[PDB]
Design an enzyme around this catalytic site. Structure first.
Site, mmCIF file in Angstrom:
data_model
loop_
_atom_site.group_PDB
_atom_site.id
_atom_site.type_symbol
_atom_site.label_atom_id
_atom_site.label_comp_id
_atom_site.label_asym_id
_atom_site.label_seq_id
_atom_site.Cartn_x
_atom_site.Cartn_y
_atom_site.Cartn_z
ATOM 1 N N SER A 94 0.830 -1.193 0.000
ATOM 2 C CA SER A 94 0.000 0.000 0.000
ATOM 3 C C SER A 94 0.876 1.259 0.000
ATOM 4 O O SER A 94 1.736 1.392 -0.845
ATOM 5 C CB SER A 94 -0.999 -0.064 1.159
ATOM 6 O OG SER A 94 -2.099 0.809 0.944
ATOM 7 N N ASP A 216 -9.972 -5.101 -4.969
ATOM 8 C CA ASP A 216 -9.307 -4.331 -3.919
ATOM 9 C C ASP A 216 -10.070 -3.023 -3.758
ATOM 10 O O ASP A 216 -10.112 -2.215 -4.685
ATOM 11 C CB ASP A 216 -7.851 -4.069 -4.319
ATOM 12 C CG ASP A 216 -7.057 -3.297 -3.259
ATOM 13 O OD1 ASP A 216 -7.619 -2.401 -2.602
ATOM 14 O OD2 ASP A 216 -5.852 -3.581 -3.106
ATOM 15 N N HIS A 245 -7.300 -5.777 0.252
ATOM 16 C CA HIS A 245 -6.215 -4.818 0.195
ATOM 17 C C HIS A 245 -4.979 -5.310 0.945
ATOM 18 O O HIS A 245 -3.894 -4.761 0.753
ATOM 19 C CB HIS A 245 -6.676 -3.494 0.796
ATOM 20 C CG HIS A 245 -5.741 -2.360 0.525
ATOM 21 N ND1 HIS A 245 -5.601 -1.798 -0.723
ATOM 22 C CD2 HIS A 245 -4.869 -1.712 1.331
ATOM 23 C CE1 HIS A 245 -4.704 -0.829 -0.671
ATOM 24 N NE2 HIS A 245 -4.243 -0.757 0.565
#
Length: 267
Positions: A94, A216, A245
């Site tokens: 991320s 996601d 995610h």
């Protein structure tokens, strides 16, 4: 050292071949628990927590320093320097994918490869770019965070993790998410969701492997294509038949072999 302690740095193994793993919003280095066992035989593994993670001291969260993603990149470079690491493979989940990218602009010599998981250079839509979010919906999100942090965490965690809402992974992420001090969570969430790394992508020189779940919440599949098209380095994309995610935590059986292939094999 104080920097290493402050980021809960863990170093497992020795030798030249080194892999450094950086985590995303709402979690901590524990997100890597299903990946690390498969790395330690072949690599020196370095884990660390982002400043502002629930496992870190909130007194060290300098709001000005972390008002731009570059502050986190400086932390990463500091850790590498303190550990005397001259070259690593960096795996960024991320926001850590972009943190690694920024660090690589300042010190490309420190990175041989970046493996990105669930990365995005921009979450906000415009007429010629789909990031997955309109500003009005981000505004509602920030409002919810400020209103009742616990309730927000409980509703957001299953959406972010995906899969069954009662899963161990959902429970785990809800816990690490609520572990953040609410003012820090709000501030960091705003900084990340409002970020824009698109313009620097052409300056990246370190090769990148772009991995994400096909489903996601925060990263439409077109974002992987955008990264591939605009990064100035050699890159490759692999979309995984997974949901969530944090797929390395919640769907390791389908996700870990893909990550390992990209770590072990060059483009």
């Amino acid at each position: 050292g104080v920097v290493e302690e402050a980021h809960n740095v863990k170093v497992i193994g020795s030798g030249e071949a080194t892999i450094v793993l950086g985590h995303g919003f709402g979690t901590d280095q524990s997100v890597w628990k299903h990946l690390v066992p498969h790395l330690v035989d072949d690599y020196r593994v370095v884990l660390y927590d982002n400043m502002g993670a629930g496992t870190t001291n909130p007194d060290y969260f300098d709001f000005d320093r972390y008002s731009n993603l570059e502050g986190y990149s400086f932390d990463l470079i500091a850790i590498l320097e303190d550990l005397k690491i001259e070259s690593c493979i960096f795996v960024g989940h991320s926001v850590s994918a972009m943190i690694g990218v920024l660090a690589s602009l300042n010190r490309p010599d420190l990175f041989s490869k970046i493996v990105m998981i669930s990365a995005s250079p921009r979450y906000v839509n415009d007429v010629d770019y789909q990031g997955g979010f309109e500003q009005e919906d981000l505004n509602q999100l920030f409002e919810a965070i400020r209103s009742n942090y616990k309730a927000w965490c409980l509703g957001f965690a299953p959406l972010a993790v995906g899969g069954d809402m009662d899963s161990i992974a959902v429970q785990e992420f809800s816990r690490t998410l609520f572990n953040m001090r609410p003012d820090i969570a709000l501030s960091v969430g705003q900084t990340i969701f409002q970020s824009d790394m698109r313009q620097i992508l052409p300056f990246v020189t370190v090769p990148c492997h772009i991995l994400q779940s096909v489903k996601d919440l925060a990263v439409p599949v077109v974002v992987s294509e955008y990264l591939h098209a605009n990064l100035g380095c050699e890159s490759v994309v692999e979309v995984i038949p997974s949901d969530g995610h944090l797929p390395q935590l919640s769907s390791p059986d389908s996700v870990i072999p893909v990550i390992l292939r990209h770590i072990r094999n060059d483009i």
